[PDB]
Design a protein around this ligand. Structure first.
Ligand SMILES: [Cl-]
Ligand SMILES: [Cl-]
Length: 282
């Protein structure tokens, strides 16, 4: 189940890697599909990036005197998915999502026909008019997807915090009092200073399950192997909630406190032997 006939003297060699990190709280479940097609004089690798990026959300006390009633909530303001390469021989010919998509569910399809013909569709609908297709699918309740950077050598997506449903209407990702609440007593736990799990969406509470694609073209001839990095990470904001007994709760946001905390894995493609292997990581 690692080689598939897609029509003609054309087939797809399916390879997959699974690299994880407890430090970064990330898991890369990538699928590297090589496109073998005599009628298309260029190597092509369809990389489908999946896995899990831990929200890394944490509620805790704040050490130091004068802060006994100041609690801290750390959460992911944005998830980061990206793939960059340096080898001159390689170029990114396509990527999904191609444009900014802000619906709760993201479902797109990358199609391929013999003769090097790729086309994308922002829907997982019909209708098998491709020799081979790969699809992305992920939910982002309260978040928005956008292509931060892109060129022939790299692509980088960002799943940003956008708007959240609250007991009292909507609230933006920049609202300083987002997720804060009085804990019903000064003896209340750190967690009680913030919104309960039922009001927190998956991307905040649990984490994010990425699902992205990007095809790489390669010039046949003394360009035997290429390397590229894949980043899965997040940008974290801090939300401090201080209880003034008998008064109320004072909150303050520290936006972009921990940016670019990413887990970068370096891979190598052996175009000739149609094979993949991990060179290293952080
Ligand atoms: Cl698929
Ligand atoms: Cl209050």
């Amino acid at each position: 189940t690692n080689i598939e006939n897609i029509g003609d003297g054309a087939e797809v060699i399916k390879r997959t890697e699974d690299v994880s990190s407890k430090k970064w709280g990330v898991t890369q479940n990538v699928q590297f599909d090589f496109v073998k097609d005599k009628k298309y004089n260029k190597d092509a690798l369809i990389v489908k990036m999946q896995g899990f990026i831990n929200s890394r959300t944490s509620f805790s006390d704040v050490k130091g005197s004068g802060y006994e009633l100041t609690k801290r909530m750390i959460w992911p303001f944005q998830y980061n998915i990206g793939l960059t390469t340096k080898d001159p021989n390689v170029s990114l010919i396509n990527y999904l999502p191609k444009n900014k998509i802000e619906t709760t569910d993201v479902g797109q399809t990358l199609g391929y026909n013999i003769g090097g013909n790729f086309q994308s569709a922002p829907s997982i609908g019909g209708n098998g008019s491709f020799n081979y297709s790969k699809t992305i699918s992920y939910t982002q309740k309260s978040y928005v997807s956008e292509v931060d950077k892109q060129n022939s050598k790299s692509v980088k997506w960002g799943v940003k915090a956008n708007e959240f449903v609250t007991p009292d209407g909507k609230k933006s990702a920049h609202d300083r009092y987002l997720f804060v609440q009085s804990p019903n007593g000064p003896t209340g736990s750190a967690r009680e200073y913030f919104a309960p799990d039922n009001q927190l969406p998956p991307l905040v509470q649990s984490g994010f399950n990425p699902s992205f694609i990007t095809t790489l073209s390669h010039e046949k001839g003394s360009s035997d192997t290429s390397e590229f990095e894949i980043s899965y990470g997040r940008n974290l904001d801090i939300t401090y909630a201080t209880l003034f007994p008998r008064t109320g709760i004072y909150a303050e946001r520290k936006h972009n406190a921990f940016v670019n905390r990413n887990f970068v894995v370096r891979y190598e493609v052996n175009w000739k032997t149609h094979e993949i292997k991990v060179k290293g990581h952080n």
